[PDB]
Design a protein around this ligand. Structure first.
Ligand SMILES: CC[C@H]1OC(=O)[C@H](C)[C@@H](O[C@H]2C[C@@](C)(OC)[C@@H](O)[C@H](C)O2)[C@H](C)[C@@H](O[C@@H]2O[C@H](C)C[C@H](N(C)C)[C@H]2O)[C@](C)(O)C[C@@H](C)CN(C)[C@H](C)[C@@H](O)[C@]1(C)O
Ligand SMILES: [Mg+2]
Ligand SMILES: [Mg+2]
Ligand SMILES: [Mg+2]
Ligand SMILES: [Mg+2]
Ligand SMILES: [Mg+2]
Ligand SMILES: [Mg+2]
Ligand SMILES: [Mg+2]
Ligand SMILES: [Mg+2]
Ligand SMILES: [Mg+2]
Ligand SMILES: [Mg+2]
Ligand SMILES: [Mg+2]
Ligand SMILES: [Mg+2]
Ligand SMILES: [Mg+2]
Ligand SMILES: [Mg+2]
Ligand SMILES: [Mg+2]
Ligand SMILES: [Mg+2]
Ligand SMILES: [Mg+2]
Ligand SMILES: [Mg+2]
Ligand SMILES: [Mg+2]
Ligand SMILES: [Mg+2]
Ligand SMILES: [Mg+2]
Ligand SMILES: [Mg+2]
Ligand SMILES: [Mg+2]
Ligand SMILES: [Mg+2]
Ligand SMILES: [Mg+2]
Ligand SMILES: [Mg+2]
Ligand SMILES: [Mg+2]
Ligand SMILES: [Mg+2]
Ligand SMILES: [Mg+2]
Ligand SMILES: [Mg+2]
Ligand SMILES: [Mg+2]
Ligand SMILES: [Mg+2]
Ligand SMILES: [Mg+2]
Ligand SMILES: [Mg+2]
Ligand SMILES: [Mg+2]
Ligand SMILES: [Mg+2]
Ligand SMILES: [Mg+2]
Ligand SMILES: [Mg+2]
Ligand SMILES: [Mg+2]
Ligand SMILES: [Mg+2]
Ligand SMILES: [Mg+2]
Ligand SMILES: [Mg+2]
Ligand SMILES: [Mg+2]
Ligand SMILES: [Mg+2]
Ligand SMILES: [Mg+2]
Ligand SMILES: [Mg+2]
Ligand SMILES: [Mg+2]
Ligand SMILES: [Mg+2]
Ligand SMILES: [Mg+2]
Ligand SMILES: [Mg+2]
Ligand SMILES: [Mg+2]
Ligand SMILES: [Mg+2]
Ligand SMILES: [Mg+2]
Ligand SMILES: [Mg+2]
Ligand SMILES: [Mg+2]
Ligand SMILES: [Mg+2]
Ligand SMILES: [Mg+2]
Ligand SMILES: [Mg+2]
Ligand SMILES: [Mg+2]
Ligand SMILES: [Mg+2]
Ligand SMILES: [Mg+2]
Ligand SMILES: [Mg+2]
Ligand SMILES: [Mg+2]
Ligand SMILES: [Mg+2]
Ligand SMILES: [Mg+2]
Ligand SMILES: [Mg+2]
Ligand SMILES: [Mg+2]
Ligand SMILES: [Mg+2]
Ligand SMILES: [Mg+2]
Ligand SMILES: [Mg+2]
Ligand SMILES: [Mg+2]
Ligand SMILES: [Mg+2]
Ligand SMILES: [Mg+2]
Ligand SMILES: [Mg+2]
Ligand SMILES: [Mg+2]
Ligand SMILES: [Mg+2]
Ligand SMILES: [Mg+2]
Ligand SMILES: [Mg+2]
Ligand SMILES: [Mg+2]
Ligand SMILES: [Mg+2]
Ligand SMILES: [Mg+2]
Ligand SMILES: [Mg+2]
Ligand SMILES: [Mg+2]
Ligand SMILES: [Mg+2]
Ligand SMILES: [Mg+2]
Ligand SMILES: [Mg+2]
Ligand SMILES: [Mg+2]
Ligand SMILES: [Mg+2]
Ligand SMILES: [Mg+2]
Ligand SMILES: [Mg+2]
Ligand SMILES: [Mg+2]
Ligand SMILES: [Mg+2]
Ligand SMILES: [Mg+2]
Ligand SMILES: [Mg+2]
Ligand SMILES: [Mg+2]
Ligand SMILES: [Mg+2]
Ligand SMILES: [Mg+2]
Ligand SMILES: [Mg+2]
Ligand SMILES: [Mg+2]
Ligand SMILES: [Mg+2]
Ligand SMILES: [Mg+2]
Ligand SMILES: [Mg+2]
Ligand SMILES: [Mg+2]
Ligand SMILES: [Mg+2]
Ligand SMILES: [Mg+2]
Ligand SMILES: [Mg+2]
Ligand SMILES: [Mg+2]
Ligand SMILES: [Mg+2]
Ligand SMILES: [Mg+2]
Ligand SMILES: [Mg+2]
Ligand SMILES: [Mg+2]
Ligand SMILES: [Mg+2]
Ligand SMILES: [Mg+2]
Ligand SMILES: [Mg+2]
Ligand SMILES: [Mg+2]
Ligand SMILES: [Mg+2]
Ligand SMILES: [Mg+2]
Ligand SMILES: [Mg+2]
Ligand SMILES: [Mg+2]
Ligand SMILES: [Mg+2]
Ligand SMILES: [Mg+2]
Ligand SMILES: [Mg+2]
Ligand SMILES: [Mg+2]
Ligand SMILES: [Mg+2]
Ligand SMILES: [Mg+2]
Ligand SMILES: [Mg+2]
Ligand SMILES: [Mg+2]
Ligand SMILES: [Mg+2]
Ligand SMILES: [Mg+2]
Ligand SMILES: [Mg+2]
Ligand SMILES: [Mg+2]
Ligand SMILES: [Mg+2]
Ligand SMILES: [Mg+2]
Ligand SMILES: [Mg+2]
Ligand SMILES: [Mg+2]
Ligand SMILES: [Mg+2]
Ligand SMILES: [Mg+2]
Ligand SMILES: [Mg+2]
Ligand SMILES: [Mg+2]
Ligand SMILES: [Mg+2]
Ligand SMILES: [Mg+2]
Ligand SMILES: [Mg+2]
Ligand SMILES: [Mg+2]
Ligand SMILES: [Mg+2]
Ligand SMILES: [Mg+2]
Ligand SMILES: [Mg+2]
Ligand SMILES: [Mg+2]
Ligand SMILES: [Mg+2]
Ligand SMILES: [Mg+2]
Ligand SMILES: [Mg+2]
Ligand SMILES: [Mg+2]
Ligand SMILES: [Mg+2]
Ligand SMILES: [Mg+2]
Ligand SMILES: [Mg+2]
Ligand SMILES: [Mg+2]
Ligand SMILES: [Mg+2]
Ligand SMILES: [Mg+2]
Ligand SMILES: [Mg+2]
Ligand SMILES: [Mg+2]
Ligand SMILES: [Mg+2]
Ligand SMILES: [Mg+2]
Ligand SMILES: [Mg+2]
Ligand SMILES: [Mg+2]
Ligand SMILES: [Mg+2]
Ligand SMILES: [Mg+2]
Ligand SMILES: [Mg+2]
Ligand SMILES: [Mg+2]
Ligand SMILES: [Mg+2]
Ligand SMILES: [Mg+2]
Ligand SMILES: [Mg+2]
Ligand SMILES: [Mg+2]
Ligand SMILES: [Mg+2]
Ligand SMILES: [Mg+2]
Ligand SMILES: [Mg+2]
Ligand SMILES: [Mg+2]
Ligand SMILES: [Mg+2]
Ligand SMILES: [Mg+2]
Ligand SMILES: [Mg+2]
Ligand SMILES: [Mg+2]
Ligand SMILES: [Mg+2]
Ligand SMILES: [Mg+2]
Ligand SMILES: [Mg+2]
Ligand SMILES: [Mg+2]
Ligand SMILES: [Mg+2]
Ligand SMILES: [Mg+2]
Ligand SMILES: [Mg+2]
Ligand SMILES: [Mg+2]
Ligand SMILES: [Mg+2]
Ligand SMILES: [Mg+2]
Ligand SMILES: [Mg+2]
Ligand SMILES: [Mg+2]
Ligand SMILES: [Mg+2]
Ligand SMILES: [Mg+2]
Ligand SMILES: [Mg+2]
Ligand SMILES: [Mg+2]
Ligand SMILES: [Mg+2]
Ligand SMILES: [Mg+2]
Ligand SMILES: [Mg+2]
Ligand SMILES: [Mg+2]
Ligand SMILES: [Mg+2]
Ligand SMILES: [Mg+2]
Ligand SMILES: [Mg+2]
Ligand SMILES: [Mg+2]
Ligand SMILES: [Mg+2]
Ligand SMILES: [Mg+2]
Ligand SMILES: [Mg+2]
Ligand SMILES: [Mg+2]
Ligand SMILES: [Mg+2]
Ligand SMILES: [Mg+2]
Ligand SMILES: [Mg+2]
Ligand SMILES: [Mg+2]
Ligand SMILES: [Mg+2]
Ligand SMILES: [Mg+2]
Ligand SMILES: [Mg+2]
Ligand SMILES: [Mg+2]
Ligand SMILES: [Mg+2]
Ligand SMILES: [Mg+2]
Ligand SMILES: [Mg+2]
Ligand SMILES: [Mg+2]
Ligand SMILES: [Mg+2]
Ligand SMILES: [Mg+2]
Ligand SMILES: [Mg+2]
Ligand SMILES: [Mg+2]
Ligand SMILES: [Mg+2]
Ligand SMILES: [Mg+2]
Ligand SMILES: [Mg+2]
Ligand SMILES: [Mg+2]
Ligand SMILES: [Mg+2]
Ligand SMILES: [Mg+2]
Ligand SMILES: [Mg+2]
Ligand SMILES: [Mg+2]
Ligand SMILES: [Mg+2]
Ligand SMILES: [Mg+2]
Ligand SMILES: [Mg+2]
Ligand SMILES: [Mg+2]
Ligand SMILES: [Mg+2]
Ligand SMILES: [Mg+2]
Ligand SMILES: [Mg+2]
Ligand SMILES: [Mg+2]
Ligand SMILES: [Mg+2]
Ligand SMILES: [Mg+2]
Ligand SMILES: [Mg+2]
Ligand SMILES: [Mg+2]
Ligand SMILES: [Mg+2]
Ligand SMILES: [Mg+2]
Ligand SMILES: [Mg+2]
Ligand SMILES: [Mg+2]
Ligand SMILES: [Mg+2]
Ligand SMILES: [Mg+2]
Lengths: 275, 48
RNA sequence: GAGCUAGCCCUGGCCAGGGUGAAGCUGGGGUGAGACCCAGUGGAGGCCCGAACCGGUGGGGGAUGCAAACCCCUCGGAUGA
RNA sequence: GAAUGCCGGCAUGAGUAACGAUAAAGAGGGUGAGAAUCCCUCUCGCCGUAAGCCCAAGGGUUCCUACGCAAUGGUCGUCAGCGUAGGGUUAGGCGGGACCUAAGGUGAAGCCGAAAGGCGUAGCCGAAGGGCAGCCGGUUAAUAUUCCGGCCCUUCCCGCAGGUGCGAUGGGGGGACGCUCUAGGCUAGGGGGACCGGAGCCAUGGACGAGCCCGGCCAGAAGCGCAGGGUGGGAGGUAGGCAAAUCCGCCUCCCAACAAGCUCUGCGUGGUGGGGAAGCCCGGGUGACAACCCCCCGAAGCCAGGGAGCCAAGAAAAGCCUCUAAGCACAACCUGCGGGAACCCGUACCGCAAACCGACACAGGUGGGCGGGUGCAAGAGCACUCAGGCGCGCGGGAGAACCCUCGCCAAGGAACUCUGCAAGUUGGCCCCGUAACUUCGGGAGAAGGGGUGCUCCCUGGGGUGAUGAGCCCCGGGGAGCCGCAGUGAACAGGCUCUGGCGACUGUUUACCAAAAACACAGCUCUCUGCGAACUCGUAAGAGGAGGUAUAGGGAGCGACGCUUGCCCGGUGCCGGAAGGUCAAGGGGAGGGGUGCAAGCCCCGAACCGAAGCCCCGGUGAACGGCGGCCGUAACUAUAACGGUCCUAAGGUAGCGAAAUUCCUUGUCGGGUAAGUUCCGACCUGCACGAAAAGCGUAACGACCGGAGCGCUGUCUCGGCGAGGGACCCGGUGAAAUUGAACUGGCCGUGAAGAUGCGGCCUACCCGUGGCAGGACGAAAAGACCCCGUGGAGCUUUACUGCAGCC
RNA sequence: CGAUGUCGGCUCGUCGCAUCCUGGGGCUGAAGAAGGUCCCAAGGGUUGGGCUGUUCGCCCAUUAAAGCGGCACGCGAGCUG
RNA sequence: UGGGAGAGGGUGGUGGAAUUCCCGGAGUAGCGGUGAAAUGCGCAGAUACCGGGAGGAACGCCGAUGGCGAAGGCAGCCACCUGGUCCACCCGUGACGCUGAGGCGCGAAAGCGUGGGGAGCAAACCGGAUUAGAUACCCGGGUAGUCCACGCCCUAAACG
RNA sequence: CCGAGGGUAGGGCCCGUGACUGGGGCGAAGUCGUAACAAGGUAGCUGUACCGGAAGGUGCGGCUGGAU
């Protein structure tokens, strides 16, 4: 559920907030946060390399466990579900019977109080992580690794998930969130379930100030610039594009495919994304 | 109205100072040239 | 050469007083249970009026200037991008 | 002798403009060669959320005293931020360093680059952030938390006593955090006192008084008191916190738990040390053996790391505490006490300014703290005023035109004008009241009106007391009084109706444009499977992102409502293992040079041979495009209908003389006495039209139109008055410009607009205040325009390259 | 072209006369009154509004009349813009 | 109290046939479609056949002139939660009843909003035919929609 | 004091009227086609939705008031 506002200001008419209902703890585990060094979009030369970034709210980075095969067999209790400003998913604090504490991204349906575990022998229940070859075909999973022991790479955003669709040799066939059909090694880990906070995509930002809180500086159209700035610059009064629509750098931006053609991973991608 | 010279000793020393010149091919050529011209000061004096 | 200016990064600081009165909560009403309604409480907001502060709308002055952009009157924002 | 030449000197304009805020001066006394200008006294005015006080930048002796006045000072000068000289800045506790990390910078290891160099985990550096021990008073011409005085405190070293498994750059805890709102209790600061202390005063009609005037505190170890912050205790298990661990984490059990306990801070008190007014008298003396008390108001400050709520989810590292490892356990550490030790740099003065940034003693710019009182609803607003500081470094007259800033105006009331430009009007608070429309918030301070002072009387609730008096905050009712007028001064919306554009708050051409432009939430297309795409870089490395398709990049459109048609022939993009074309390379029929020869060397056909292009499809919120002619209906007119040429296809819905309409002031209607504008219609749309979006839309706008009401010197149409200039006298004294000048009018002439030529007319010599018609007046080697085989920015299916990609 | 500032308005005029009015005339298809047309005449006079940047023009209400031209399409070291 | 029948409703699961698409094989000169045709698809290897996979929707036979519901309407199968109704006993209450303006709830399909999903079908649309013409009927394509969740809409030859 | 009413301001209801515009009825002597009544030459009707010179068409679902 997403929360609306009465229109007692022009911007509150449309503004919506997350309901934050799943959140049981309002402070991060101190041993698990580090400062997040804001960049402004500038690289190590001082140069803007990603436009329109900067000036968002201060954040601490919560250390997330994207491995979990780190601790095979050691169960843990779901102690809390917390807010994480560095991602759309919520995070879940785990208390291992080890006494070690860790964050994972909170799956849909996770319950504070329940227990989860990782390993080849783990039950097929929401919150547990297994190598891909031990999860039944048809199971929806998230936090999927792409290569063994390299870290969960796929299906990490709010409400996303991948589905297992078959097996073939050492690999298992996944349907990624994008709809792509891809081979992933069977030894890659995944966590059964879908990522939570699925209402994330129904948030209406509401005003320009809200993008600013998120670190998004105003984006300015090429058409509003001059020929020294952008292919769409200049013209007297308003102008149509007057050429194939292009980026600030001249490459075409309405259909031009851009994945590198001789890329080794193409052997493992069965079907390009649909839609 | 606010003008262009707003003196600041740390800024002066860190920007035009002797050590800043020495760290850099172009800066050592400034010192070499000013020495060759016989300048009395090779670098702005800043109080510290 | 970024001690002016533009953007960003780190760390500090500032914004008189007044006005409006969102959610929620409590009580009452209502119903099979509800929705909802009323009152109180509450104190939200690129909300309102207005100083500091930030501006520079219209007019007047100035025009070998007090000033290589100033002055008076008026005017915009003033918890926020 | 000329180059708007160059350097210098000196003229002209000219005793002219000006002398830098209109906060303001007058007199007496003194000094001196000289005094509007220096010192002193009295009077007057100005600032007082500052124009007063303190701190940080920056400045660098400008500070204090003596002696000076050539120059500097917009005049003067005896004076000075000026000249000469002498003096002046005192710290274990204030700030910085011998502590910590932030961005960033640097950088063992490592990586990269023709060279120079670029990067880079650790580490190091880096502060106005973290951490750390001093308060009050006195003293100097000039320093003071630094000297002195009183009362306090920190670290290091050594020793003594007691206690303990001591020991770290390693483990852990803590340090450690947002925004808005906010409780309790305090303090700062303030108001009052018929009480306490005090030199005195009785004026001019009254008052010897519960009179007037003045003051009535500051710091303070331990202890104690009030108020707060922080913190659960024990045992057992233990596989996690890259070794170890008794610590921390996890599990269980017992007790304690909104109590307490322990601990820490604030405030009060506190041995003790200080301070101490008006007035009088020559900074000091006196007041004075000063008194030093009660009531009230009360922070944004303190307790603090308090509490709640919210989403955008809010540094690090050390000090500190705890754990153990080597080790070492006669040590080491902890606690108490004692003695000793305790370095370097800054410290003057200015500091919203005459000492900083602006060439100037420049109406400009400059971060933090304190910033009293009364009244006005509040307040840091406004008026006055305290402490404190000033009167702005040319003056004296005069009383013209004109200019500036200001005040008022008969009758009219927008008739002004591009426009009510400007200026009036309105104006705070309380009460009554308030429309279309609406996204149900709003529109709204709609509009419109009523009240507002003072006196007496009665009374209501809150705060503090105590539950009462007193004080204080918010009120209420009745009866009266005065004036032209009661937010009596200062600060404080004119309003309404209706269109265009943009939804909205925001942003912008620093210094001619603030807008309808940019942005914006939101909508759609598209790219991207993660060593992502994309961006910067030769690279390494970075950003993206410590993110992962509910994500990230690119593009257009721009809240929201209802919508977004047809054309894929061309261009783009996407798909297509066929076919055609296709480079290097492969192949080697055949041919050539040379040699006596084996041989060496060269040319070279078929055939094989990628991307790209051709070709086949798809694709519009991709670039874009979206017809013409003839005929036809009981009068006319028109044409639902038919025919025909062309096209890739012929503009759908909606809107339309429009931010678009040439003809054009189209025509009709509305408003007006009169309407090229405005509003409403019509549709022959020169030349609207659907995300360079179409048509609407409440609310919003220093946007741009049109109308009305109110009110006015905008105007009829001008008048008077004020001050600052202008004018006269004393002081100081520029500027552009200038071929030289002994520089009149007409009609002619002249390179075609003559003071300068001809004819004629007119005219004694020289100034001062004024006005601008001429000197084709000044300024700027015309921006327009052209020319130059001049330049530069920008575009593209111009040429030719390059990067990048294939 | 080493610069001769431009429309329109305002202000301030002055001139020409091919005269709009007022004065004097002849002819008339001049009864009168009112006109028409031409001649003489430049002394003075020649309104206020709505629209539009406008000049011009149209219109409202008046008038004896609501003249037309020149003066760098008079006049920006006079103003406006 | 004791029994019954039933596509009554709601939720979670789950099975098979078929269609379409994708991959592998095998194969070649057409397939498709109609009254007859053409557009279309097919030597860039279609149709027909075999194997594998994905995905959505609807449930063949049973099935009836049947059953249930107040109406709309409900059909594979399993479970859970839940409504109405019939019978037998004649045991309990003692007229507690009938109707019902307003009210409230439910209400096929289409349609709307926000998400998802999308095989087949198919308004709009494009093309081929038919025809005097053919903005149709028929044929080849084709987007909303049809499906799920939640919220609206409240209509009907909502009929016996 | 109250007070006829006058004045200022803002609302509500009704009537008349208005450039232009929407459809309706009647007229009939026209133009276009032929949607319905027969299986009306695509059974009809229907709610809704989208479309078309027009009657209408199509989709989805419903009714028989459908011939054979
Ligand atoms: C406001 C102060 C300024 O003074 C002005 O603005 C004047 C009103 C300006 O005038 C303004 C306003 C305006 C309307 O003047 C007519 C405009 O056209 C010009 C460009 O500038 C002048 C008349 C222009 O001089 C005009 O240059 C035109 C191109 C041609 C014209 N011709 C008539 C010869 C000539 O007078 C000029 C070129 O600006 C002057 C030039 C010599 C020097 N300027 C550079 C100076 C520094 C000015 O900035 C200034 C003194 O500070
Ligand atoms: Mg909302
Ligand atoms: Mg709300
Ligand atoms: Mg709500
Ligand atoms: Mg709004
Ligand atoms: Mg919420
Ligand atoms: Mg949540
Ligand atoms: Mg939730
Ligand atoms: Mg926090
Ligand atoms: Mg990080
Ligand atoms: Mg980072
Ligand atoms: Mg760096
Ligand atoms: Mg760098
Ligand atoms: Mg970018
Ligand atoms: Mg950026
Ligand atoms: Mg989160
Ligand atoms: Mg969310
Ligand atoms: Mg959104
Ligand atoms: Mg953010
Ligand atoms: Mg964006
Ligand atoms: Mg933009
Ligand atoms: Mg532009
Ligand atoms: Mg550039
Ligand atoms: Mg370019
Ligand atoms: Mg370009
Ligand atoms: Mg362009
Ligand atoms: Mg253009
Ligand atoms: Mg343009
Ligand atoms: Mg433009
Ligand atoms: Mg254009
Ligand atoms: Mg443009
Ligand atoms: Mg634009
Ligand atoms: Mg263009
Ligand atoms: Mg375009
Ligand atoms: Mg083009
Ligand atoms: Mg891979
Ligand atoms: Mg500065
Ligand atoms: Mg300096
Ligand atoms: Mg400095
Ligand atoms: Mg500094
Ligand atoms: Mg600096
Ligand atoms: Mg230096
Ligand atoms: Mg020098
Ligand atoms: Mg020397
Ligand atoms: Mg130097
Ligand atoms: Mg540099
Ligand atoms: Mg700077
Ligand atoms: Mg900070
Ligand atoms: Mg503020
Ligand atoms: Mg309230
Ligand atoms: Mg609450
Ligand atoms: Mg605001
Ligand atoms: Mg406001
Ligand atoms: Mg201004
Ligand atoms: Mg004004
Ligand atoms: Mg004025
Ligand atoms: Mg100027
Ligand atoms: Mg000013
Ligand atoms: Mg001013
Ligand atoms: Mg104002
Ligand atoms: Mg305001
Ligand atoms: Mg405010
Ligand atoms: Mg704001
Ligand atoms: Mg010569
Ligand atoms: Mg010269
Ligand atoms: Mg000269
Ligand atoms: Mg010269
Ligand atoms: Mg010279
Ligand atoms: Mg001379
Ligand atoms: Mg002169
Ligand atoms: Mg002069
Ligand atoms: Mg001057
Ligand atoms: Mg003044
Ligand atoms: Mg003197
Ligand atoms: Mg003198
Ligand atoms: Mg004096
Ligand atoms: Mg200096
Ligand atoms: Mg001193
Ligand atoms: Mg002197
Ligand atoms: Mg002198
Ligand atoms: Mg001097
Ligand atoms: Mg001076
Ligand atoms: Mg002397
Ligand atoms: Mg001086
Ligand atoms: Mg001395
Ligand atoms: Mg000391
Ligand atoms: Mg030392
Ligand atoms: Mg520090
Ligand atoms: Mg102290
Ligand atoms: Mg001293
Ligand atoms: Mg932290
Ligand atoms: Mg901090
Ligand atoms: Mg804030
Ligand atoms: Mg007080
Ligand atoms: Mg207390
Ligand atoms: Mg253990
Ligand atoms: Mg004393
Ligand atoms: Mg004494
Ligand atoms: Mg405050
Ligand atoms: Mg959020
Ligand atoms: Mg760090
Ligand atoms: Mg040992
Ligand atoms: Mg101990
Ligand atoms: Mg030392
Ligand atoms: Mg020193
Ligand atoms: Mg000092
Ligand atoms: Mg100032
Ligand atoms: Mg100086
Ligand atoms: Mg200057
Ligand atoms: Mg300068
Ligand atoms: Mg001065
Ligand atoms: Mg100054
Ligand atoms: Mg004070
Ligand atoms: Mg007031
Ligand atoms: Mg007030
Ligand atoms: Mg004010
Ligand atoms: Mg006072
Ligand atoms: Mg003065
Ligand atoms: Mg005079
Ligand atoms: Mg008057
Ligand atoms: Mg009027
Ligand atoms: Mg009037
Ligand atoms: Mg106007
Ligand atoms: Mg007022
Ligand atoms: Mg109204
Ligand atoms: Mg409303
Ligand atoms: Mg609102
Ligand atoms: Mg009012
Ligand atoms: Mg209004
Ligand atoms: Mg009185
Ligand atoms: Mg008065
Ligand atoms: Mg005043
Ligand atoms: Mg106001
Ligand atoms: Mg209105
Ligand atoms: Mg218009
Ligand atoms: Mg609009
Ligand atoms: Mg706007
Ligand atoms: Mg705009
Ligand atoms: Mg809008
Ligand atoms: Mg918008
Ligand atoms: Mg906006
Ligand atoms: Mg604002
Ligand atoms: Mg500008
Ligand atoms: Mg400019
Ligand atoms: Mg400029
Ligand atoms: Mg400039
Ligand atoms: Mg500029
Ligand atoms: Mg301006
Ligand atoms: Mg501007
Ligand atoms: Mg503005
Ligand atoms: Mg915009
Ligand atoms: Mg939109
Ligand atoms: Mg690059
Ligand atoms: Mg890297
Ligand atoms: Mg990265
Ligand atoms: Mg990163
Ligand atoms: Mg990402
Ligand atoms: Mg925009
Ligand atoms: Mg609407
Ligand atoms: Mg069309
Ligand atoms: Mg096309
Ligand atoms: Mg194409
Ligand atoms: Mg093209
Ligand atoms: Mg031979
Ligand atoms: Mg579309
Ligand atoms: Mg084309
Ligand atoms: Mg286009
Ligand atoms: Mg006819
Ligand atoms: Mg057209
Ligand atoms: Mg039209
Ligand atoms: Mg229009
Ligand atoms: Mg047009
Ligand atoms: Mg034209
Ligand atoms: Mg026109
Ligand atoms: Mg026109
Ligand atoms: Mg007209
Ligand atoms: Mg107009
Ligand atoms: Mg106009
Ligand atoms: Mg027409
Ligand atoms: Mg565009
Ligand atoms: Mg446009
Ligand atoms: Mg609007
Ligand atoms: Mg505006
Ligand atoms: Mg006047
Ligand atoms: Mg007067
Ligand atoms: Mg006067
Ligand atoms: Mg005067
Ligand atoms: Mg005067
Ligand atoms: Mg005289
Ligand atoms: Mg001469
Ligand atoms: Mg001439
Ligand atoms: Mg001449
Ligand atoms: Mg002549
Ligand atoms: Mg002459
Ligand atoms: Mg001569
Ligand atoms: Mg001669
Ligand atoms: Mg002569
Ligand atoms: Mg003469
Ligand atoms: Mg003379
Ligand atoms: Mg003249
Ligand atoms: Mg002149
Ligand atoms: Mg002359
Ligand atoms: Mg002249
Ligand atoms: Mg001239
Ligand atoms: Mg030149
Ligand atoms: Mg030239
Ligand atoms: Mg030129
Ligand atoms: Mg020039
Ligand atoms: Mg030319
Ligand atoms: Mg040429
Ligand atoms: Mg030539
Ligand atoms: Mg040339
Ligand atoms: Mg060029
Ligand atoms: Mg590329
Ligand atoms: Mg010229
Ligand atoms: Mg010249
Ligand atoms: Mg010139
Ligand atoms: Mg007659
Ligand atoms: Mg005659
Ligand atoms: Mg005359
Ligand atoms: Mg005359
Ligand atoms: Mg005209
Ligand atoms: Mg006309
Ligand atoms: Mg008459
Ligand atoms: Mg007459
Ligand atoms: Mg003329
Ligand atoms: Mg002419
Ligand atoms: Mg002309
Ligand atoms: Mg002129
Ligand atoms: Mg001018
Ligand atoms: Mg003019
Ligand atoms: Mg002239
Ligand atoms: Mg004008
Ligand atoms: Mg073949
Ligand atoms: Mg059957
Ligand atoms: Mg019985
Ligand atoms: Mg329904
Ligand atoms: Mg539907
Ligand atoms: Mg036809
Ligand atoms: Mg549709
Ligand atoms: Mg749709
Ligand atoms: Mg039936
Ligand atoms: Mg009356
Ligand atoms: Mg028929
Ligand atoms: Mg039929
Ligand atoms: Mg139609
Ligand atoms: Mg038609
Ligand atoms: Mg159809
Ligand atoms: Mg039915
Ligand atoms: Mg029948």
């Amino acid at each position: 559920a997403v929360k609306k506002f009465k229109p007692y200001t022009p911007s509150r008419r449309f503004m919506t907030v997350a309901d934050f209902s799943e959140i049981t703890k309002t402070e991060p585990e101190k041993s698990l946060v580090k400062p997040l060094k804001k960049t402004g979009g500038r690289n190590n030369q001082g140069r803007i390399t990603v436009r329109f970034r900067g000036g968002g709210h201060k954040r601490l980075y919560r250390i997330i466990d994207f491995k979990r095969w780190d601790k095979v067999g050691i169960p843990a209790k779901v102690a809390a579900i917390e807010y994480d400003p560095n991602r759309s998913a919520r995070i879940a604090l785990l208390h291992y019977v080890d006494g070690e504490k860790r964050y994972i991204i909170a799956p849909d349906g996770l319950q504070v109080g329940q227990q989860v575990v990782a390993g080849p022998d783990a039950p097929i229940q929401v919150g547990n992580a297994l190598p891909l070859r031990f999860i039944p075909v048809g199971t929806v999973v998230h936090a999927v690794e792409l290569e063994p022991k390299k870290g969960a790479k796929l299906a990490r955003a709010a409400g996303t998930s991948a589905q297992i669709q078959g097996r073939e040799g050492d690999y298992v066939i996944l349907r990624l969130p994008s709809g792509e059909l891809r081979k992933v090694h069977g030894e890659c880990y995944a966590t059964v379930g879908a990522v939570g906070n699925a209402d994330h995509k129904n948030i209406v930002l509401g005003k320009a100030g809200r993008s600013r809180w998120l670190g998004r500086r105003p984006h300015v159209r090429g058409a509003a610039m001059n020929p020294v700035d952008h292919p769409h610059g200049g013209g007297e009064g308003r102008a149509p594009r007057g050429r194939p629509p292009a980026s600030p750098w001249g490459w075409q931006t309405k259909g031009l495919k851009t994945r590198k053609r001789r890329k080794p991973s193409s052997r493992f991608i069965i079907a390009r994304r649909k839609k | 109205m606010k003008r262009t010279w707003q003196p600041n000793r740390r800024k002066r020393a860190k920007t035009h100072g002797f050590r800043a010149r020495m760290r850099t091919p172009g800066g050592r050529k400034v010192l070499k040239r000013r020495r060759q011209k016989g300048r009395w000061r090779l670098t702005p004096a800043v109080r510290k």
